[PDB]
Each structure stands twice: as C-alpha cells, then as structure tokens.
A paper describes a structure:
Plasmid-based extended-spectrum AmpC enzymes, such as the [name] β-lactamases, are increasingly found in clinical isolates from antibiotic-resistant infections. [name] is of interest because it rapidly hydrolyzes cephamycins. The first generation of BATSIs inactivated serine β-lactamases (Ambler classes A, C, and D) through a dative and reversible covalent bond to the active site serine nucleophile. In this analysis, the [name] of [name] in complex with SM23 and [name], a ceftazidime mimic, is described.
[name] has the R1 side chain of CAZ and aztreonam. Firstly, [name] (CAZ analog) solution in DMSO was added to the crystallization drop to bring the inhibitor concentration to 9 mM, and the [name] was frozen after 2 h. The electron density map at a resolution of 1.9 Å shows the [name] (CAZ analog) molecule covalently attached to S64, but the oxyimino side chain, past the imine nitrogen, is missing. In contrast to the SM23 (CEF analog) complex in which inhibitor binding caused change in the unit cell parameters, the [name] (CAZ analog) complex has the same unit cell as apo [name]. The R1 side chain rings adopt different conformations in [name]. In cefoxitin and [name] (CAZ analog), the ring is perpendicular with Y221 and makes side-to-face π-stacking interactions; in SM23 (CEF analog), it moves out of range. The bulky oxime group, which is missing in the [name] [name], is well resolved in the [name] AmpC structures with the carboxylate oriented toward its canonical carboxylate binding pocket (N343, R349). The same replacements may account for the disordered oxime side chain of [name] (CAZ analog), which binds in the same location. It is notable that the cefotaxime-like [name] shows a slightly lower affinity than [name] (CAZ analog), suggesting that while the larger oxime side chain of [name] is disordered, it does contribute somewhat to the overall affinity. [name] (CAZ analog) mimics the CTX-like [name], and binds 2.5-fold more tightly, suggesting that the extended oxime side chain encourages binding.
Numbering used by the authors: 7 to 361
Amino acid sequence: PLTATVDGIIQPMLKAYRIPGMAVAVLKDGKAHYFNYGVANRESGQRVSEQTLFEIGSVSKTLTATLGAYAAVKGGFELDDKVSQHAPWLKGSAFDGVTMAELATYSAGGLPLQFPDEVDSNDKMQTYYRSWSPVYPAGTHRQYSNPSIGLFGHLAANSLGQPFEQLMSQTLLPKLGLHHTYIQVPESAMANYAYGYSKEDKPIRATPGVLAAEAYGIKTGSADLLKFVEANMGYQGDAALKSAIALTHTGFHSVGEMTQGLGWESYDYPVTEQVLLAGNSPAVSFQANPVTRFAVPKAMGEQRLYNKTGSTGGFGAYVAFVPARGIAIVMLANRNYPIEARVKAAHAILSQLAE
Ligand code: NA
Ligand SMILES: [Zn+2]
Ligand SMILES: [Zn+2]
Ligand SMILES: [Zn+2]
Ligand SMILES: [Zn+2]
Ligand SMILES: [Zn+2]
C-alpha cells in the first residue's frame, strides 16, 4: 500500500531531524503521487504542497547538464572540444587542455568544491580560471565541484549566444513543460516559496553568487521536479530535447560503483543501500578520487538507478529514478538534513515501489 508506506518512512525521519516541511512525489505505473508534510513557513504555518517552491541545491546540476547537452545537440559545441575553444578569455590557460565533457563531469583536474574566498565577481572569476593550475592531469580524477560544472553551464549557454538564465527560463524549462520552476522566483510566485531553516533554526534562503544559478540555483516544487524526472523516463517530443536527455544518461567514468554522467550519477540496478550510501558519501563528494576511465562514453541505459543529491543552507533535496521499472522518487525538504537519511529513505521507498 502506497500512502502508509511513504508515511511510515518519511514521518519518523521528519521528527528525528526536525524537518519543518517536506514535499514527496513518486512515480509508479505511469502516475504521479504526491505526499506532503508539515510547513513551508514555520512562523506563518503555511502547509507544504506539491506546488510549494523549495531550493533544490545541486539537483539543479541535472537541469544545467540538460541545458548543456541541449546546446551540444544544437551544435554550440562538442563534448570533446577543449574548453578554451569556447571561452576566448581562457585561450592560453590550462583550459587549453580540458574538454567540455571533463568540465561537466568534475574531471578537469582538481577544481575545488567552492570558489575560493574572494572569487566572487565576474571579473575575478575570469582571472581565477585564467590563472588556475591543474592539480591532476585532465580526465584522471573526479572532484565534485561547483566551479567545474558552473563554467560548463555558462559556456554552454554562451555557445548558443545567450546568458545561462535566459536559455534556461525561455527555452529549456518551457520545452520540458516546467512552467513553475525558477532560477529567480518572480513576485507572482513568491507566495509559494518556502523558508529554509538553518542549523540554528533561523529562516534562510540562498543568495545569488558567481555561477550559482548553474550550480545550485533552481527553485521548484515536487510536481514540476517529478515532471522533469518523467521526461528522463520517456520523453517523446522535440527530437533535440530527447537527444539531450539521452546525453545526460551517458556515462563518462566511474568511481567505485557510481558512474558519472552529465549531472546524473547512476548505479547498476538492482542496487543495495550500502552501495548507494557509499556513492553519495563524503568519501566520494568531498575529496578527489581517481576515476575508472572509459574507452569511450557509454550509454548507460534503462537498468540503472539514476540519482542526484542537493543542498543549500536551509534546504535538502534528493531525486532517484529507475527507468526499467518505471519508478521514481522526489524528496524536497526545508532543512539541510543528512544525505545519509535521504538515501535510506528513498531506497526503502523505491524498494517497495518495485515489488
Ligand atoms: Na517480491
Ligand atoms: Zn496516487
Ligand atoms: Zn568579495
Ligand atoms: Zn562569460
Ligand atoms: Zn511558462
Ligand atoms: Zn536514457
């Protein structure tokens, strides 16, 4: 049984981690199912719905990756192009020796998790990339990195002659049928925007930063985010967007049991909880690891679990889907609670959905 299942997993988790609100959406047998808990705003008491806007943090990277793939499919660049081919200001830099695909998959050579301290203007960002010295040879190490995929999204949008935000809001989101998903939440929708809650229980929301839109800037609810997942299960429409989504299901290297694609990370299905936790642990996400290189990028197919974790100061999100079994789960919360718990919860739920 569906509702009691989700409730049984989710609600104890909300109490244990003091999660004020969570929106959950699952895909099964071709239908969306919504389960909503608690409040978007603990002081007003406004209840969470599938239309409540959450910061989804790095789940945004899957949309950025899709935009990037779309630009590639439309001929703005080839994934194997050197980065400086698409960044005149980077010619002569280390990015002469880095591909767009490496940049998208955090394997450029040791770009850090966050921009350094005062790399926080466009002009200082440009100087930063220009003067960057690789820690590792290109394509040998995976180090999860906002600068890395941030630059990828930025240059990809530029290859079509548009700012990232414009290409996302005027082309990609509308073509995916996502009309309630935002990089900047309009006044008209501000009523739906949840508050995040810090470790100290203060209401907070993410602020704009250098390449923040690209790396972790999407606000959306569970309904829209599930629609994006549905497009990843079977999109039939514009051939280009279909081809783009297909590119995000391509694997470029692996780290242990996890295969890195564009935005999505995936596992061989069926996958155990232990393997899913490991692939999403600090061991993989907060340090550089040598990769298992692929002879050529590989279409990963349907017998996979695809996922992405996402966090901001006040928000915690998780998404996972399994195309061959037609199941997916979206979990959006307004507290940045341990990824470990997100993963157990989702695994327990998906396990039941499969059955
Ligand atoms: Na069974
Ligand atoms: Zn239902
Ligand atoms: Zn500054
Ligand atoms: Zn630029
Ligand atoms: Zn629209
Ligand atoms: Zn696919």
